């Protein structure tokens with residue numbers, strides 16, 4: 001029982017049990033008794049009217065229209081408009097902000113993050129007639145057509161990602177609700193457990209800023225502080241003296257999410273919440289202008305996720321699938337997470353639950369996954385709060401445990417689904433001296449903003465999942481100049497060193513069936529004469545310590561690892577006019593030793609013969625060889641990789657059918673393909689002592705995934721091998737699995753399911769980099785910033 005007089009919304013939290021007056025005291029029930037009275041005034045609303053102009057100051061009012069209000073910094077945001085003949089910010093023409101236009105004493109342009117909830121990307125077009133303030137920021141500043149959220153596309157995972165640059169698996173906020181089995185505790189959007197710091201990892205922007213001497217309070221706000229008071233509080237803090245005034249601010253809205261859940265993303269009821277949000281942006285913008293800061297402050301208008309049509313009747317029930325549904329706990333809704341109801345149960349079987357949920361109903365509106373089998377693009381596995389069993393739920397559907405969980409309809413909207421889904425996409429607009437003027441930028445991921453916000457504030461970012469430099473094109477002036485990571489391992493270039501009779505690999509090939517214009521041509525090819533043709537962007541750099549060989553061939557070049565006994569990468573180009581052939585019958589099972597590489601660093605056919613589960617495929621496909629003579633190169637033991645027969649069905653369709661179709665559609669393609677090892681599902685390259693599976697009785701390690709990166713010219717009138725402008729890329733990371741249980745239609749012809757599987761497993765080049773320790777596109781004519789943007793690109797396969 002102290003007092004909040006003169007202390008209203010103090011930035012520093014005061015020591016217990018002395019009462020608090022900061023923006024969080026209400027959450028902790030620890031405000032002074034007069035907090036409401038002094039700090040949450042509402043009298044007379046939030047607008048000046050003419051009759052108030054030059055009033056005698058009445059300290060009980062929510063805001064002021066008295067002559068002294070500018071000096072005090074507590075005018076209603078519309079004061080100068082209603083009482084001084086001034087115009088609303090939205091009514092001013094927009095004028096380029098070439099330099100920061102800040103009052104004396106401002107050391108840097110302030111950053112204000114304006115965060116909207118459930119603000120679906122398409123609201124920017126569809127709601128344009130009712131959001132004039134937001135439409136002005138959008139067209140005058142720098143904007144993307146949409147921004148991709150993290151998965152799950154829920155509120156808390158995304159807001160903390162925005163603040164950290166980290167995937168939820170890394171920052172720890174992996175859901176709106178979660179259970180930590182080490183804490184034996186549950187975090188919920190509502191309640192006080194979330195106040196415990198033990199849930200929150202990484203280093204949020206306000207901590208980064210503080211550690212480096214830039215003032216910034218926490219971004220959290222007590223729920224019962226309304227939005228008009230939040231704006232007035234930011235505007236007040238902006239009037240503090242230089243030595244006390246923060247440089248970063250965050251405002252968060254409950255809308256349009258609150259209404260969208262009730263009404264659907266496009267319910268007629270949705271127009272008003274969009275109007276109210278625009279009005280709030282108007283208030284902030286008029287207030288900034290009153291403080292002469294509207295050409296000084298950088299403003300970020302950003303959403304956390306979109307919103308989809310979802311109703312009670314579109315719910316799948318696990319009780320329709322599982323006989324023993326009471327033995328599980330489900331995190332339900334737009335995603336599913338399943339764990340044992342009771343830990344003291346060795347009669348709980350994840351494999352049997354998964355099998356009972358797999359392809360059981362023809363139209364089944366969810367798919368089960370062990371978390372490590374989820375598409376790697378989701379980066380959703382490496383945290384103990386993520387249950388081993390995950391259900392990816394179709395857009396527009398829910399999953400629930402039992403029917404009484406849903407009837408004990410409330411809602412018409414929800415969000416949470418896979419982050420590639422169009423309806424889950426959200427918004428980004430940057431406006432201010434440091435952002436560009438009237439500029440559209442390509443869609444990008446919210447994990448990249450932490451770095452940009454650090455650049456906006458002169459800060460060195462904490463280590464995070466953004467790729468710093470990838471968003472330099474948003475900025476008029478950047479403090480960050482990216483440079484390529486240095487190569488750690490230089491390759492060996494072996495010559496012909498071994499005779500055939502030194503190998504005992506138990507391999508066979510029909511190849512003895514045997515000119516100097518042609519023979520000199522074949523040795524030129526083994527020495528890299530065609531390398532300009534098949535390695536278009538230089539060779540990848542190896543960023544870790546290892547031993548490997550560059551191997552040249554007429555059709556493909558490779559980086560062959562002597563430690564993993566297989567290529568780390570295989571690079572080749574297939575022109576639009578290139579032709580597909582078959583494997584001649586006499587070479588069906590041909591494998592040939594490579595006289596450049598020792599028996600001791602080679603795979604062997606015997607292991608594959610003995611391993612009754614594991615077969616093999618090739619990284620450069622025999623099917624695409626340029627000539628009957630070159631085809632022999634494709635059967636080298638150095639081009640071979642371990643592959644489950646079930647996976648060979650996928651890979652063979654990709655190599656025999658899809659590669660050629662891409663070359664026809666894209667006017668040639670360059671392909672880089674290779675294995676990935678990620679047994680501990682942390683998204684990062686495994687070292688050799690982390691490998692859990694080998695081909696039986698050998699040291700040949702088994703990949704968890706195979707990747708390919710597929711590059712051509714953005715201008716497809718030019719061929720892939722003669723491109724002088726920007727590049728186009730799509731990539732995938734395919735799980736290397738011994739069954740096709742993921743694909744419910746896999747009994748059918750590959751043309752009915754393979755491409756669908758690959759699209760699900762689409763990836764950024766940067767994801768493959770993390771997973772292999774390789775750095776691509778080292779030698780192009782493109783700027784490094786442009787290449788970094790290319791490496792973060794995801795081909796989504798969604799409609800427009």
Ligand SMILES: *[C@@H]1O[C@H](CO)[C@@H](O[C@@H]2O[C@H](CO)[C@@H](O[C@@H]3O[C@H](CO[C@H]4O[C@H](CO)[C@@H](O)[C@H](O[C@H]5O[C@H](CO)[C@@H](O)[C@H](O)[C@@H]5O[C@H]5O[C@H](CO)[C@@H](O)[C@H](O)[C@@H]5O)[C@@H]4O)[C@@H](O)[C@H](O)[C@@H]3O)[C@H](O)[C@H]2NC(C)=O)[C@H](O)[C@H]1NC(C)=O
Pocket residue numbers: 166167169170171172198199200201202379382383384463464465682683684770
């Ligand atoms: C996305 O970007 C992040 C950030 O760069 C990368 O994460 C880093 O990975 C490296 C290599 O695996 C880790 O290094 C290890 O660090 C530990 C000591 O770790 C402690 O100290 C660090 C640094 O101050 C701290 O950040 C760590 O925080 C983890 O654990 C906390 C509590 O246990 C938790 O609150 C927090 O969320 C975080 O959890 C996550 O990471 C851990 C692994 O560290 C993991 O078990 C957990 O499930 C979560 O995923 C920690 O207290 C050394 O002893 C090791 O030898 C090793 O050097 C970094 O710790 C790690 N940092 C963070 C913030 O996660 C990702 O790899 C990158 N992803 C991709 C795909 O590139």
Ligand SMILES: CNC(=O)C[C@@H](NC(=O)Cn1cnc2ccc(N3CCN(C(C)=O)CC3)cc2c1=O)c1ccc([N+](=O)[O-])cc1
Pocket residue numbers: 024027156159160161163194195196197200218219220221222223252253254
């Ligand atoms: C309209 N929407 C909003 O206002 C969104 C806003 N919601 C809240 O702040 C709701 N709330 C209310 N009182 C709290 C009191 C204490 C805490 N702990 C958390 C852990 N601590 C740390 C880590 O410092 C100490 C403080 C949290 C809260 C809290 O979440 C929000 C902003 C940023 C982020 N974000 O994730 O960045 C998430 C959530």
Ligand SMILES: [Ca+2]
Pocket residue numbers: 117118154155156257304305
């Ligand atoms: Ca939200």
Ligand SMILES: [Ca+2]
Pocket residue numbers: 677678679680681682683684685686
């Ligand atoms: Ca790993």
Ligand SMILES: [Cl-]
Pocket residue numbers: 152154174175176177178331
């Ligand atoms: Cl959740």
Ligand SMILES: [K+]
Pocket residue numbers: 608609610611612613614615
């Ligand atoms: K076999």
Ligand code: NA
Pocket residue numbers: 740741742743744745746747
């Ligand atoms: Na199947």
Ligand SMILES: [Zn+2]
Pocket residue numbers: 118155257258261415
């Ligand atoms: Zn919501």
